[PDB]
């Protein structure tokens, strides 16, 4: 979907994921949260809060792991 | 997040005029006498009170911390600043010795210890180790230059290109006034902030490069930055940040 | 240039008080410190200098055993780091009959007991042993560094619960070699083995009250 | 010359004698093994030892020479290929030499990490109490725990259960 | 008059190995392996007693005076040596920092000063603190080498060809990861020493070209020496001396 449509999907996920654990497990195992992290949002637009609510349903380690450039981040923290 | 006009040495020169006026706001002179007599009087003070720099003395007690907080490692990142500060002896010479050991380890890393540098986002070190630098645009134009900083034989090309900036290296563009190295590769990372003021310094416009990556073999390139002719409303300002060492 | 320069000579446990005055070479803020390699050579860290006066830096020495110690003195000034190299002995005469060998063991525990043996020469002393018992022989071969009374290890126990009687002594190999070889020391022992294998067995039946 | 004899001579006892001479040469100070290793003889000895067509005496002398050389060799680039082609009874000397050389150099540790050899080191088992165990522990101590865990087997599954 | 083959680095390496040997005479391993034992013992031991300097907590008596009489300024130019000395602190930390800062002043000489070398007989500093470098020969004939160390902005080529010691600066031909500078004129205060002995230990020879000064230009050809090997005793051993700072 184009970015102007993804806002509704991210909002629906941020509304549905908090009240189910199996859906969160399926979303993580399908690697959909990585794509959500790959989606940009305006710093203040409803999409940004939807993304933040998506991240809050999981421990910060999981959110960081699926964040873009995480493996390189590990490489540089090694340095 | 200081728009450096134009190098850290300029920062400390302004701060030196300011410290002198804090100490001796007696007469009613101007800036040129301020700087010249400031250099002269700092040398005279060092001669008067040896074994101790001024910041460790009575009136300098409130000013010892406020000058400890500065980027004391980057004003002396200029070659001549070392001898200048040693002749004036404002920063304690033990502080100077410690930071000189830091710069010695820096050249050891850059020339010997398999220098990798910041490949990516090491943000705190990139605020403690990147070179703040820029220019005010009274009028727009193309401006490029060479910077033999404490990259120790390595050299820098920074190029502003009329609303855009080219990040490069200087090895094939200009022979040096000091010394150059045969260093093959230095992998770096950098940030640049371009902001259009409301003329008098009021700001409602600013653009950072987020933070990006650049590798530097002999004159390697990276160009990602955008402004336009509207954003050229003078004075336009530049602030580059480059770090080559870990 | 004061010359009340003195060197310590004292027996064990006796606190000696002597003076070491020195004239320096350069002139600035006169605050002085010493680095010492050598034990009992305890002293304060700081001392100041007055009107070119006969001034001395405190340093103690209280030996506790039958020893000597060479003092290593590396000197350090606060301003520049000037030094004035002087080295002094420290001697102690405390014998617990030189040393005794006391052992509490079981049947077969050949115990290793420390023997405090003095060294009043300045050469690596190296003793040889002759004893009329095989149960009392030294740790390979006794060797003692000079000055200090470095102890030694000895293997002492009879093969059963009992007491084998034997005379064990130490003569020297060549700080003067005459004083070296005149330090013919004989040490007395003490053995306590404990039971032990049993033999006899008796079973009985008794009455309470 | 010993390498040439070991290589070009098709005879078995000639190869065995060359291997024995090389092993006697390399059992001395680490300079001897370094001078031997730079001539590219250890890979040939290792290949001949794992060669089924080689004779009993040839393989015996090759193994003896390998044991006598790797116990003193300090040239890390020469010992690196052994991490992937040597039998477990030989890797102990390699790991011990690495644990003896790596703590006193930073560039060699950087090269070892960038070549992914500590992955293989973590992929080698050891007896809980054998010298190989302590050698591996010393190897891991030369780096921060995060590097060791990242290069440890199952760390991918550790991420899997973590995220 | 020690015959040094070649520099003070391995000299201090042997000094530290023998430091361990006489400090721990209970060791009976190998001498090149003694590098490993000495480094392990000393490094781990100070890792037990960190913070404190090396000699304070009951370390070697006979060798501490030797080391504080030593020419410690150029030994730790290798950064691995610097890390090891920070790991061992065989020199007290104050003089350690002094060494680091004077090495930074050497950096400053190379960059600011464009240092040219001794133009006059600096024999006092030669006998006290200068470096020595020489070579042993398995046969008479050819032995050449590029010279490095603190090269400022250049490199040096010194040859020994059938007893014909060539000196020529390398600023143009043999590459390295180091640096090149504009420093035209390079000079040294040097001496060549020879004295021959037999298998048992009887010495019946002595040769010295006198403590002299050599002045050279960028890649300049200069050769002064001659000898006769049917006279000398081989395997020959030659000890040369040099100094490079003003």
mmCIF file with all atom_site columns, C-alpha atoms in Angstrom, chain C residues 2-149:
data_model
loop_
_atom_site.group_PDB
_atom_site.id
_atom_site.type_symbol
_atom_site.label_atom_id
_atom_site.label_alt_id
_atom_site.label_comp_id
_atom_site.label_asym_id
_atom_site.label_entity_id
_atom_site.label_seq_id
_atom_site.pdbx_PDB_ins_code
_atom_site.Cartn_x
_atom_site.Cartn_y
_atom_site.Cartn_z
_atom_site.occupancy
_atom_site.B_iso_or_equiv
_atom_site.pdbx_formal_charge
_atom_site.auth_seq_id
_atom_site.auth_comp_id
_atom_site.auth_asym_id
_atom_site.auth_atom_id
_atom_site.pdbx_PDB_model_num
ATOM 1   C CA . UNK C 1 2   ? 75.977 19.508  57.617 1.00 0.00 ? 2   UNK C CA 1
ATOM 2   C CA . UNK C 1 3   ? 77.700 16.069  57.970 1.00 0.00 ? 3   UNK C CA 1
ATOM 3   C CA . UNK C 1 4   ? 75.763 14.711  60.981 1.00 0.00 ? 4   UNK C CA 1
ATOM 4   C CA . UNK C 1 5   ? 75.096 11.974  58.407 1.00 0.00 ? 5   UNK C CA 1
ATOM 5   C CA . UNK C 1 6   ? 74.545 8.815   60.468 1.00 0.00 ? 6   UNK C CA 1
ATOM 6   C CA . UNK C 1 7   ? 73.914 5.136   59.741 1.00 0.00 ? 7   UNK C CA 1
ATOM 7   C CA . UNK C 1 8   ? 71.777 2.904   61.938 1.00 0.00 ? 8   UNK C CA 1
ATOM 8   C CA . UNK C 1 9   ? 73.196 0.261   64.286 1.00 0.00 ? 9   UNK C CA 1
ATOM 9   C CA . UNK C 1 10  ? 70.633 -1.353  66.596 1.00 0.00 ? 10  UNK C CA 1
ATOM 10  C CA . UNK C 1 11  ? 69.536 -4.805  67.826 1.00 0.00 ? 11  UNK C CA 1
ATOM 11  C CA . UNK C 1 12  ? 66.045 -6.288  67.495 1.00 0.00 ? 12  UNK C CA 1
ATOM 12  C CA . UNK C 1 13  ? 62.959 -4.455  68.779 1.00 0.00 ? 13  UNK C CA 1
ATOM 13  C CA . UNK C 1 14  ? 65.034 -1.451  69.819 1.00 0.00 ? 14  UNK C CA 1
ATOM 14  C CA . UNK C 1 15  ? 63.800 1.753   68.143 1.00 0.00 ? 15  UNK C CA 1
ATOM 15  C CA . UNK C 1 16  ? 66.907 3.646   67.059 1.00 0.00 ? 16  UNK C CA 1
ATOM 16  C CA . UNK C 1 17  ? 66.878 7.396   66.395 1.00 0.00 ? 17  UNK C CA 1
ATOM 17  C CA . UNK C 1 18  ? 69.612 8.760   64.124 1.00 0.00 ? 18  UNK C CA 1
ATOM 18  C CA . UNK C 1 19  ? 69.930 11.776  61.848 1.00 0.00 ? 19  UNK C CA 1
ATOM 19  C CA . UNK C 1 20  ? 70.488 12.074  58.085 1.00 0.00 ? 20  UNK C CA 1
ATOM 20  C CA . UNK C 1 21  ? 71.062 15.745  57.117 1.00 0.00 ? 21  UNK C CA 1
ATOM 21  C CA . UNK C 1 22  ? 71.576 16.650  53.450 1.00 0.00 ? 22  UNK C CA 1
ATOM 22  C CA . UNK C 1 23  ? 72.401 19.791  51.460 1.00 0.00 ? 23  UNK C CA 1
ATOM 23  C CA . UNK C 1 24  ? 70.508 20.089  48.171 1.00 0.00 ? 24  UNK C CA 1
ATOM 24  C CA . UNK C 1 25  ? 71.651 21.513  44.816 1.00 0.00 ? 25  UNK C CA 1
ATOM 25  C CA . UNK C 1 26  ? 68.840 23.750  43.486 1.00 0.00 ? 26  UNK C CA 1
ATOM 26  C CA . UNK C 1 27  ? 66.528 26.222  45.219 1.00 0.00 ? 27  UNK C CA 1
ATOM 27  C CA . UNK C 1 28  ? 62.741 26.534  45.095 1.00 0.00 ? 28  UNK C CA 1
ATOM 28  C CA . UNK C 1 29  ? 59.762 25.512  47.245 1.00 0.00 ? 29  UNK C CA 1
ATOM 29  C CA . UNK C 1 30  ? 61.422 22.930  49.503 1.00 0.00 ? 30  UNK C CA 1
ATOM 30  C CA . UNK C 1 31  ? 59.077 20.004  50.136 1.00 0.00 ? 31  UNK C CA 1
ATOM 31  C CA . UNK C 1 32  ? 60.553 16.530  49.984 1.00 0.00 ? 32  UNK C CA 1
ATOM 32  C CA . UNK C 1 33  ? 59.508 12.869  49.751 1.00 0.00 ? 33  UNK C CA 1
ATOM 33  C CA . UNK C 1 34  ? 61.241 9.468   49.745 1.00 0.00 ? 34  UNK C CA 1
ATOM 34  C CA . UNK C 1 35  ? 60.600 6.092   48.102 1.00 0.00 ? 35  UNK C CA 1
ATOM 35  C CA . UNK C 1 36  ? 61.785 3.058   50.077 1.00 0.00 ? 36  UNK C CA 1
ATOM 36  C CA . UNK C 1 37  ? 62.356 -0.583  49.141 1.00 0.00 ? 37  UNK C CA 1
ATOM 37  C CA . UNK C 1 38  ? 63.056 -2.291  52.442 1.00 0.00 ? 38  UNK C CA 1
ATOM 38  C CA . UNK C 1 39  ? 60.919 -3.250  55.408 1.00 0.00 ? 39  UNK C CA 1
ATOM 39  C CA . UNK C 1 40  ? 60.654 -1.578  58.835 1.00 0.00 ? 40  UNK C CA 1
ATOM 40  C CA . UNK C 1 41  ? 61.870 1.542   56.995 1.00 0.00 ? 41  UNK C CA 1
ATOM 41  C CA . UNK C 1 42  ? 58.645 3.359   57.828 1.00 0.00 ? 42  UNK C CA 1
ATOM 42  C CA . UNK C 1 43  ? 58.564 7.141   57.681 1.00 0.00 ? 43  UNK C CA 1
ATOM 43  C CA . UNK C 1 44  ? 56.355 10.175  57.086 1.00 0.00 ? 44  UNK C CA 1
ATOM 44  C CA . UNK C 1 45  ? 55.844 11.344  53.496 1.00 0.00 ? 45  UNK C CA 1
ATOM 45  C CA . UNK C 1 46  ? 56.499 15.068  53.886 1.00 0.00 ? 46  UNK C CA 1
ATOM 46  C CA . UNK C 1 47  ? 59.184 17.320  55.337 1.00 0.00 ? 47  UNK C CA 1
ATOM 47  C CA . UNK C 1 48  ? 60.099 20.957  54.672 1.00 0.00 ? 48  UNK C CA 1
ATOM 48  C CA . UNK C 1 49  ? 63.470 22.730  54.651 1.00 0.00 ? 49  UNK C CA 1
ATOM 49  C CA . UNK C 1 50  ? 64.317 25.918  56.517 1.00 0.00 ? 50  UNK C CA 1
ATOM 50  C CA . UNK C 1 51  ? 67.246 28.364  56.506 1.00 0.00 ? 51  UNK C CA 1
ATOM 51  C CA . UNK C 1 52  ? 69.783 25.951  55.052 1.00 0.00 ? 52  UNK C CA 1
ATOM 52  C CA . UNK C 1 53  ? 69.558 24.152  58.379 1.00 0.00 ? 53  UNK C CA 1
ATOM 53  C CA . UNK C 1 54  ? 70.800 20.767  59.564 1.00 0.00 ? 54  UNK C CA 1
ATOM 54  C CA . UNK C 1 55  ? 67.439 19.078  58.949 1.00 0.00 ? 55  UNK C CA 1
ATOM 55  C CA . UNK C 1 56  ? 66.666 15.358  58.899 1.00 0.00 ? 56  UNK C CA 1
ATOM 56  C CA . UNK C 1 57  ? 63.786 13.289  57.472 1.00 0.00 ? 57  UNK C CA 1
ATOM 57  C CA . UNK C 1 58  ? 62.132 10.805  59.860 1.00 0.00 ? 58  UNK C CA 1
ATOM 58  C CA . UNK C 1 59  ? 62.299 7.077   59.148 1.00 0.00 ? 59  UNK C CA 1
ATOM 59  C CA . UNK C 1 60  ? 61.867 4.195   61.591 1.00 0.00 ? 60  UNK C CA 1
ATOM 60  C CA . UNK C 1 61  ? 63.244 0.669   61.903 1.00 0.00 ? 61  UNK C CA 1
ATOM 61  C CA . UNK C 1 62  ? 61.968 -1.878  64.455 1.00 0.00 ? 62  UNK C CA 1
ATOM 62  C CA . UNK C 1 63  ? 63.209 -5.388  63.627 1.00 0.00 ? 63  UNK C CA 1
ATOM 63  C CA . UNK C 1 64  ? 61.313 -8.314  65.135 1.00 0.00 ? 64  UNK C CA 1
ATOM 64  C CA . UNK C 1 65  ? 63.641 -11.224 64.352 1.00 0.00 ? 65  UNK C CA 1
ATOM 65  C CA . UNK C 1 66  ? 67.279 -12.264 63.888 1.00 0.00 ? 66  UNK C CA 1
ATOM 66  C CA . UNK C 1 67  ? 67.886 -10.339 60.689 1.00 0.00 ? 67  UNK C CA 1
ATOM 67  C CA . UNK C 1 68  ? 69.402 -7.417  58.825 1.00 0.00 ? 68  UNK C CA 1
ATOM 68  C CA . UNK C 1 69  ? 67.910 -5.303  56.033 1.00 0.00 ? 69  UNK C CA 1
ATOM 69  C CA . UNK C 1 70  ? 69.502 -3.108  53.386 1.00 0.00 ? 70  UNK C CA 1
ATOM 70  C CA . UNK C 1 71  ? 67.539 0.088   52.807 1.00 0.00 ? 71  UNK C CA 1
ATOM 71  C CA . UNK C 1 72  ? 66.839 1.253   49.267 1.00 0.00 ? 72  UNK C CA 1
ATOM 72  C CA . UNK C 1 73  ? 66.230 5.004   49.115 1.00 0.00 ? 73  UNK C CA 1
ATOM 73  C CA . UNK C 1 74  ? 65.127 6.758   45.928 1.00 0.00 ? 74  UNK C CA 1
ATOM 74  C CA . UNK C 1 75  ? 64.442 10.416  46.607 1.00 0.00 ? 75  UNK C CA 1
ATOM 75  C CA . UNK C 1 76  ? 61.923 12.791  45.065 1.00 0.00 ? 76  UNK C CA 1
ATOM 76  C CA . UNK C 1 77  ? 61.323 16.546  45.283 1.00 0.00 ? 77  UNK C CA 1
ATOM 77  C CA . UNK C 1 78  ? 57.948 18.226  44.830 1.00 0.00 ? 78  UNK C CA 1
ATOM 78  C CA . UNK C 1 79  ? 59.183 20.985  42.507 1.00 0.00 ? 79  UNK C CA 1
ATOM 79  C CA . UNK C 1 80  ? 61.782 19.291  40.294 1.00 0.00 ? 80  UNK C CA 1
ATOM 80  C CA . UNK C 1 81  ? 62.448 15.838  41.738 1.00 0.00 ? 81  UNK C CA 1
ATOM 81  C CA . UNK C 1 82  ? 65.955 16.095  43.192 1.00 0.00 ? 82  UNK C CA 1
ATOM 82  C CA . UNK C 1 83  ? 67.455 13.074  44.943 1.00 0.00 ? 83  UNK C CA 1
ATOM 83  C CA . UNK C 1 84  ? 70.319 12.318  47.331 1.00 0.00 ? 84  UNK C CA 1
ATOM 84  C CA . UNK C 1 85  ? 71.227 8.639   47.291 1.00 0.00 ? 85  UNK C CA 1
ATOM 85  C CA . UNK C 1 86  ? 72.178 7.207   50.697 1.00 0.00 ? 86  UNK C CA 1
ATOM 86  C CA . UNK C 1 87  ? 71.660 3.581   51.762 1.00 0.00 ? 87  UNK C CA 1
ATOM 87  C CA . UNK C 1 88  ? 71.676 2.250   55.331 1.00 0.00 ? 88  UNK C CA 1
ATOM 88  C CA . UNK C 1 89  ? 71.414 -1.101  57.125 1.00 0.00 ? 89  UNK C CA 1
ATOM 89  C CA . UNK C 1 90  ? 68.925 -2.163  59.770 1.00 0.00 ? 90  UNK C CA 1
ATOM 90  C CA . UNK C 1 91  ? 69.840 -5.038  62.083 1.00 0.00 ? 91  UNK C CA 1
ATOM 91  C CA . UNK C 1 92  ? 67.882 -7.214  64.490 1.00 0.00 ? 92  UNK C CA 1
ATOM 92  C CA . UNK C 1 93  ? 68.935 -9.873  67.022 1.00 0.00 ? 93  UNK C CA 1
ATOM 93  C CA . UNK C 1 94  ? 65.803 -11.791 68.092 1.00 0.00 ? 94  UNK C CA 1
ATOM 94  C CA . UNK C 1 95  ? 66.288 -15.549 68.415 1.00 0.00 ? 95  UNK C CA 1
ATOM 95  C CA . UNK C 1 96  ? 63.408 -17.767 69.534 1.00 0.00 ? 96  UNK C CA 1
ATOM 96  C CA . UNK C 1 97  ? 66.294 -20.054 70.313 1.00 0.00 ? 97  UNK C CA 1
ATOM 97  C CA . UNK C 1 98  ? 66.803 -19.020 66.677 1.00 0.00 ? 98  UNK C CA 1
ATOM 98  C CA . UNK C 1 99  ? 63.763 -21.213 66.002 1.00 0.00 ? 99  UNK C CA 1
ATOM 99  C CA . UNK C 1 100 ? 62.109 -24.395 67.240 1.00 0.00 ? 100 UNK C CA 1
ATOM 100 C CA . UNK C 1 101 ? 60.250 -27.104 65.333 1.00 0.00 ? 101 UNK C CA 1
ATOM 101 C CA . UNK C 1 102 ? 56.838 -28.000 66.781 1.00 0.00 ? 102 UNK C CA 1
ATOM 102 C CA . UNK C 1 103 ? 54.626 -30.556 65.036 1.00 0.00 ? 103 UNK C CA 1
ATOM 103 C CA . UNK C 1 104 ? 51.199 -32.048 65.719 1.00 0.00 ? 104 UNK C CA 1
ATOM 104 C CA . UNK C 1 105 ? 50.719 -34.976 63.342 1.00 0.00 ? 105 UNK C CA 1
ATOM 105 C CA . UNK C 1 106 ? 49.212 -38.442 62.924 1.00 0.00 ? 106 UNK C CA 1
ATOM 106 C CA . UNK C 1 107 ? 50.939 -41.724 62.068 1.00 0.00 ? 107 UNK C CA 1
ATOM 107 C CA . UNK C 1 108 ? 52.712 -41.080 58.766 1.00 0.00 ? 108 UNK C CA 1
ATOM 108 C CA . UNK C 1 109 ? 52.191 -37.308 58.452 1.00 0.00 ? 109 UNK C CA 1
ATOM 109 C CA . UNK C 1 110 ? 55.696 -36.123 57.564 1.00 0.00 ? 110 UNK C CA 1
ATOM 110 C CA . UNK C 1 111 ? 55.028 -32.504 58.481 1.00 0.00 ? 111 UNK C CA 1
ATOM 111 C CA . UNK C 1 112 ? 56.746 -29.532 56.840 1.00 0.00 ? 112 UNK C CA 1
ATOM 112 C CA . UNK C 1 113 ? 57.674 -27.079 59.609 1.00 0.00 ? 113 UNK C CA 1
ATOM 113 C CA . UNK C 1 114 ? 59.179 -23.621 59.161 1.00 0.00 ? 114 UNK C CA 1
ATOM 114 C CA . UNK C 1 115 ? 62.569 -22.928 60.759 1.00 0.00 ? 115 UNK C CA 1
ATOM 115 C CA . UNK C 1 116 ? 63.491 -19.265 61.230 1.00 0.00 ? 116 UNK C CA 1
ATOM 116 C CA . UNK C 1 117 ? 67.222 -19.333 60.414 1.00 0.00 ? 117 UNK C CA 1
ATOM 117 C CA . UNK C 1 118 ? 69.254 -16.090 60.527 1.00 0.00 ? 118 UNK C CA 1
ATOM 118 C CA . UNK C 1 119 ? 71.560 -14.651 57.877 1.00 0.00 ? 119 UNK C CA 1
ATOM 119 C CA . UNK C 1 120 ? 74.117 -12.180 59.256 1.00 0.00 ? 120 UNK C CA 1
ATOM 120 C CA . UNK C 1 121 ? 76.235 -12.097 56.085 1.00 0.00 ? 121 UNK C CA 1
ATOM 121 C CA . UNK C 1 122 ? 75.902 -10.394 52.703 1.00 0.00 ? 122 UNK C CA 1
ATOM 122 C CA . UNK C 1 123 ? 76.317 -13.477 50.512 1.00 0.00 ? 123 UNK C CA 1
ATOM 123 C CA . UNK C 1 124 ? 73.804 -16.111 49.436 1.00 0.00 ? 124 UNK C CA 1
ATOM 124 C CA . UNK C 1 125 ? 74.197 -18.636 52.240 1.00 0.00 ? 125 UNK C CA 1
ATOM 125 C CA . UNK C 1 126 ? 73.688 -22.273 51.293 1.00 0.00 ? 126 UNK C CA 1
ATOM 126 C CA . UNK C 1 127 ? 73.766 -24.799 54.130 1.00 0.00 ? 127 UNK C CA 1
ATOM 127 C CA . UNK C 1 128 ? 74.467 -28.531 54.038 1.00 0.00 ? 128 UNK C CA 1
ATOM 128 C CA . UNK C 1 129 ? 72.881 -31.037 56.418 1.00 0.00 ? 129 UNK C CA 1
ATOM 129 C CA . UNK C 1 130 ? 74.251 -34.045 58.308 1.00 0.00 ? 130 UNK C CA 1
ATOM 130 C CA . UNK C 1 131 ? 71.854 -35.891 60.620 1.00 0.00 ? 131 UNK C CA 1
ATOM 131 C CA . UNK C 1 132 ? 71.682 -39.349 62.203 1.00 0.00 ? 132 UNK C CA 1
ATOM 132 C CA . UNK C 1 133 ? 68.006 -39.791 61.252 1.00 0.00 ? 133 UNK C CA 1
ATOM 133 C CA . UNK C 1 134 ? 66.444 -40.424 57.859 1.00 0.00 ? 134 UNK C CA 1
ATOM 134 C CA . UNK C 1 135 ? 63.089 -39.098 59.115 1.00 0.00 ? 135 UNK C CA 1
ATOM 135 C CA . UNK C 1 136 ? 64.500 -35.554 59.464 1.00 0.00 ? 136 UNK C CA 1
ATOM 136 C CA . UNK C 1 137 ? 65.872 -34.262 56.154 1.00 0.00 ? 137 UNK C CA 1
ATOM 137 C CA . UNK C 1 138 ? 65.671 -30.804 54.651 1.00 0.00 ? 138 UNK C CA 1
ATOM 138 C CA . UNK C 1 139 ? 63.639 -29.452 51.760 1.00 0.00 ? 139 UNK C CA 1
ATOM 139 C CA . UNK C 1 140 ? 66.019 -30.531 48.984 1.00 0.00 ? 140 UNK C CA 1
ATOM 140 C CA . UNK C 1 141 ? 68.786 -28.128 50.007 1.00 0.00 ? 141 UNK C CA 1
ATOM 141 C CA . UNK C 1 142 ? 68.509 -25.122 52.319 1.00 0.00 ? 142 UNK C CA 1
ATOM 142 C CA . UNK C 1 143 ? 69.519 -21.793 50.766 1.00 0.00 ? 143 UNK C CA 1
ATOM 143 C CA . UNK C 1 144 ? 69.033 -18.416 52.463 1.00 0.00 ? 144 UNK C CA 1
ATOM 144 C CA . UNK C 1 145 ? 69.362 -14.926 51.014 1.00 0.00 ? 145 UNK C CA 1
ATOM 145 C CA . UNK C 1 146 ? 71.529 -12.423 52.940 1.00 0.00 ? 146 UNK C CA 1
ATOM 146 C CA . UNK C 1 147 ? 70.462 -9.924  55.610 1.00 0.00 ? 147 UNK C CA 1
ATOM 147 C CA . UNK C 1 148 ? 66.997 -11.173 56.544 1.00 0.00 ? 148 UNK C CA 1
ATOM 148 C CA . UNK C 1 149 ? 66.376 -14.368 58.517 1.00 0.00 ? 149 UNK C CA 1
#
